[PDB]
Design an enzyme around this catalytic site. Structure first.
Site, short mmCIF file in Angstrom:
data_model
loop_
_atom_site.label_atom_id
_atom_site.label_comp_id
_atom_site.label_asym_id
_atom_site.label_seq_id
_atom_site.Cartn_x
_atom_site.Cartn_y
_atom_site.Cartn_z
N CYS B 46 0.82 -1.21 0.00
CA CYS B 46 0.00 0.00 0.00
C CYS B 46 0.86 1.26 0.00
O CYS B 46 1.66 1.48 0.91
CB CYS B 46 -0.96 0.01 1.20
N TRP B 47 0.68 2.08 -1.03
CA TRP B 47 1.40 3.33 -1.19
C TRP B 47 0.72 4.45 -0.40
O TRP B 47 1.19 5.59 -0.38
CB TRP B 47 1.50 3.69 -2.67
#
Ligand SMILES: Cc1cc2nc3c(=O)[nH]c(=O)nc-3n(C[C@H](O)[C@H](O)[C@H](O)COP(=O)(O)OP(=O)(O)OC[C@H]3O[C@@H](n4cnc5c(N)ncnc54)[C@H](O)[C@@H]3O)c2cc1C
Ligand code: SF4
Ligand code: SF4
Lengths: 662, 166
Positions: B46-47
């Site tokens: 997850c960015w």
């Protein structure tokens, strides 16, 4: 309870369908590059080739896909009153002299036009009012001032402009959609291969990929295509190895596809030795700039001294050779002075925002104080929310406690403050040298085309021409978009053919699925199994090898011929092991192919730094065995061409032509 | 990383796009079809771009800051409207700061990319369709770099070793 019984959690994965597409123009990727390409191509096709089938494919959904996913706070390329010569001059200094100046100039005289389109489309752009005070996009419109009206932007440096660009990407993706329509855009489909023609030598013919929402292998036949799928991140071990694997500066989903998909097919690669290691806030990697110039907060070591002043001497050998002279230091040399403060343990490199705020708040009115704080926080909320989360978490509102600076693990990109990528073609003018022009078997030269005939790339794709940013990326796509429609009309009666059958392609794409199916019975746990290898484990084994032998963070960006050689030895056991990758679900099949793209690129990047026997980018990476730069033997580009038939790479020097003086 | 509030999530019953699953640039959001609840299938990829957090109709998705370096208590919550965005930053100690920014001046889905603009011109020059002229470098040079190549500066003749005919 037994892990092999547990449900895979991805989409499904089963025997794929195989669905073919005959198309005239294919576009792989839907970031800033191809959204510019589509916009331009449609217009030229609507007039000159309305029967021509155009298709855009994206790993994600076009609305938010790519680096501009959470938006931006600035557009970093905008001339407007500036001339494209000082633009080339500035990009040359920053990237240590070795750049394709024709590509940079060509990118200059097209770029503003995209920015002007953006505003018109709905992008809120900041404009100076009359007394030199900032107006945001909404109120600039309200006042009746615009870039269209030539009103001079806010601008925090000669070349950049301020924007309320949270919805930046969606605004651009919209223009690309309305030009194409949900009939020429198929989303949620990952491209893996790129196929070239069975008949004419060195000519592109197609592309293979798979659907991420259903079991389908897609085979695309094409006349001309762009491959613009961003740069390469998570090729080196990050500073946070737990969940923080997802918190990298550049988008975590950039798998180095653009680079490998083209290199794999025979395109000439350039400047792959170049990397980019940004200096951003610790762990969250949020932008620092605003806090520095809006409030005058500086970086101080453990002694509270300015390490830039203290370590000035380190720049002597470079300024005497004309690389840095007079407080215009290249970004790489800036964090070259940072590294000695680190490795000698005089850290942490610290932004004292506490005292810098309480002093600047004395010379500002209470309402003027809310405004400069709201500008600064927007740099996070518009650009990098992860950082704002960290500050929320660590009780680090700048008023009460400062923050740490740290240089990041290397990223491989061509659009931003880097320049690694694919050897493209110059426009074909008198001012462009002959070596900078590709020119096809038909004799004519098409702009930004690779050495593979009929294949284009742009933005992160084209190397040796950095500092494109969000505007140049769009502009380059526009440049290519036209050239593809032009190409098609000169090669209108093509009919592409592959050496490989549709079954052969399908059994390749889903190999990791078969690997898992055939070998899963061996173990009670799907991950720990001697028959295959998990994509998450492949991911880890690679980034470890690169960190330790390719000059990652763990080794203070340091490498040598000996270290690289050890790297390569492990690298090609990993290459072999990739044949035994495994996928339990569709999401794992995605990771399986992304990590394979990640290998081929990071390896190529190392093969380039192994070749170049100088340390051209000090502060980004060092050759321990060739510590200093050398304009005698290495004033040039370093290119490579992969041979598909002979599975051999050939790394060679490529001459650099100086075009803009000074 | 992002997580879904099960009490808020309805699995997008109408308009058969699963907003979160559709939008995620990294293919992380996925719906459990039986439970009609969604989740992040790979949180360490997850960015934290908030794409799914913004698009969620129910507002079921919040972000827990990366556990392996970020302490608990802190959170950012957006409320992205048609033309503006509201952020509320909740701190670990209880502090709250709020913000409001513009996101777009024109209405959503309204861009006519070509309306009014010039038609396609010459297929053979470097002009884009919206352009009419382009700049040419002030002063343009064609100076090749040239590299020495030879591994020695050594010379054993008496005479410079320059006109190496053989
Ligand atoms: C944190 C950060 C801050 C930035 N700040 C600024 C700034 O302030 N100002 C500025 O001007 N620029 C800024 N940029 C730089 C700018 O975002 C990039 O230069 C630009 O987005 C590059 O666009 P691109 O052509 O490489 O496509 P990208 O936007 O990188 O997107 C790549 C596309 O390719 C697709 N794709 C990837 N792999 C595949 C696959 N194999 N198959 C099919 N499709 C695939 C993806 O879905 C995506 O749509 C910033 C970038 C980063 C992330
Ligand atoms: S968009 Fe929101 S409500 Fe819909 S499935 Fe996703 S988390 Fe649940
Ligand atoms: S925050 Fe962004 S990258 Fe992470 S799961 Fe949500 S949409 Fe995907």
């Amino acid at each position: 309870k037994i892990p092999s019984k547990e449900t895979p959690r991805g989409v499904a994965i089963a025997e794929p369908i195989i669905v073919e597409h005959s198309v005239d123009l294919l576009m792989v990727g839907g970031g800033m590059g191809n959204c510019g390409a589509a916009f331009e191509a449609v217009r030229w096709a609507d007039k000159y080739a309305p029967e021509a089938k155009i298709l855009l494919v994206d790993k994600a959904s076009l609305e938010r896909s790519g680096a501009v996913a959470q938006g931006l706070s600035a557009i970093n390329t905008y001339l407007g009153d500036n001339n494209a010569d000082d633009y080339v001059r500035m990009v040359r200094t920053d990237l240590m002299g070795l750049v394709r100046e024709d590509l940079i100039y060509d990118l200059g005289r097209h770029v503003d036009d995209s920015v002007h389109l953006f505003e018109e489309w709905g992008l809120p752009v900041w404009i100076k009012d009359e007394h030199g005070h900032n107006l945001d996009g909404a109120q600039a419109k309200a006042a009746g001032k615009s870039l269209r009206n030539g009103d001079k932007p806010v601008r925090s440096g000669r070349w950049q402009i301020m924007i309320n660009g949270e919805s930046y990407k969606v605004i651009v993706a919209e223009a690309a959609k309305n030009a194409l329509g949900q009939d020429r855009i198929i989303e949620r489909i990952f491209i893996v291969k790129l196929l070239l023609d069975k008949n004419t030598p060195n000519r592109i013919a197609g592309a293979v990929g798979f659907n991420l929402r259903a079991n389908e292998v897609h085979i695309f036949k094409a006349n001309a295509m762009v491959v613009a799928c961003g740069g390469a991140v998570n090729v080196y071990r990050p500073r946070s190895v737990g969940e923080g694997m997802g918190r990298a500066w550049y988008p975590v989903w950039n798998a180095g596809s653009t680079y490998t998909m083209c290199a794999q097919v025979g395109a000439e690669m350039t400047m792959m030795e170049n990397r980019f290691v940004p200096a951003r806030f610790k762990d969250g990697y949020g932008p620092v700039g605003a806090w520095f110039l809006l409030f005058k907060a500086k970086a101080t070591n453990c002694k509270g001294e300015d390490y830039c002043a203290t370590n000035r001497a380190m720049l002597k050998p470079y300024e005497e050779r004309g690389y840095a002279k007079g407080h215009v230091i290249p970004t790489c040399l800036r964090n070259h002075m940072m590294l000695r403060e680190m490795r000698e343990g005089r850290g942490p490199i610290y932004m004292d925002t506490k005292t810098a705020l309480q002093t600047s708040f004395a010379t500002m009115s209470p309402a003027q104080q809310k405004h400069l704080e709201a500008e600064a926080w927007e740099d996070f909320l518009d650009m990098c929310v992860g950082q704002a989360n960290l500050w929320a978490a660590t009780n680090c509102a700048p008023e009460e406690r400062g923050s740490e600076i740290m240089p990041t693990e290397p990223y491989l990109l061509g659009s931003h403050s880097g320049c690694c990528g694919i050897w493209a073609s110059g426009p074909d003018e008198a001012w462009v040298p002959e070596d900078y022009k590709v020119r096809a078997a038909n004799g004519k030269v098409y702009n930004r085309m690779t050495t593979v005939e009929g294949l284009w790339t742009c933005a992160d794709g084209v190397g040796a021409s950095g500092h494109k940013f969000s505007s140049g990326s769009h502009a380059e796509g526009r440049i290519v978009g036209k050239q593809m429609v032009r190409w098609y009309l000169d090669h209108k009666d093509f009919k592409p053919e592959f050496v490989e059958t549709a079954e052969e392609l399908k059994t390749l794409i889903y190999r990791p699925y078969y690997n898992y199916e055939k070998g899963k019975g061996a173990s009670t746990c799907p991950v720990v199994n001697p028959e295959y290898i998990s994509p998450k484990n492949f991911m880890m084994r690679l980034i470890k090898c690169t960190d330790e032998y390719g000059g990652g963070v763990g080794t203070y960006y340091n490498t040598s011929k000996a270290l690289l050689d050890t790297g390569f030895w492990l690298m090609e056991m990993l290459e072999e092991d990739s044949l035994k990758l495994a996928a339990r679900d569709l999401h794992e099949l995605l990771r399986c192919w992304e990590n394979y793209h990640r290998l081929w690129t990071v390896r190529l990047h190392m093969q380039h730094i192994a070749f170049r026997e100088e340390s051209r980018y000090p502060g980004f990476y060092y050759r321990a065995d060739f510590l200093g730069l050398d304009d005698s033997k290495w004033k040039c580009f370093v290119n490579s061409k992969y041979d598909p038939a002979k599975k051999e790479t050939k790394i060679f020097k490529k001459p650099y032509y100086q075009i803009i003086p000074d | 990383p992002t997580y879904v509030d099960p009490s808020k999530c309805d699995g997008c019953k109408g308009g058969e796009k699963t907003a979160c699953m559709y939008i995620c640039p990294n293919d992380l959001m996925i719906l459990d079809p039986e439970e009609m609840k969604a989740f992040n299938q790979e949180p360490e990829a997850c960015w934290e771009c908030y794409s799914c957090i913004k698009i969620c109709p129910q507002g079921a998705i919040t972000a827990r800051p990366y556990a392996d370096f970020a302490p608990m208590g802190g959170t950012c919550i957006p409320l992205r409207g048609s033309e503006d965005i509201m952020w509320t930053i909740k701190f670990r100690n209880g502090s709250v700061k709020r913000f409001k920014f513009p996101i777009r001046t024109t209405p959503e889905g309204s861009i006519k990319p070509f309306e009014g603009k010039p038609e396609a011109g010459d297929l053979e020059n470097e002009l884009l369709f919206t352009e009419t002229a382009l700049t040419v470098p002030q002063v343009a040079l064609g100076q090749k770099a040239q590299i020495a190549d030879a591994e020695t500066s050594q010379c054993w003749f008496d005479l410079p070793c320059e006109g190496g005919n053989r």
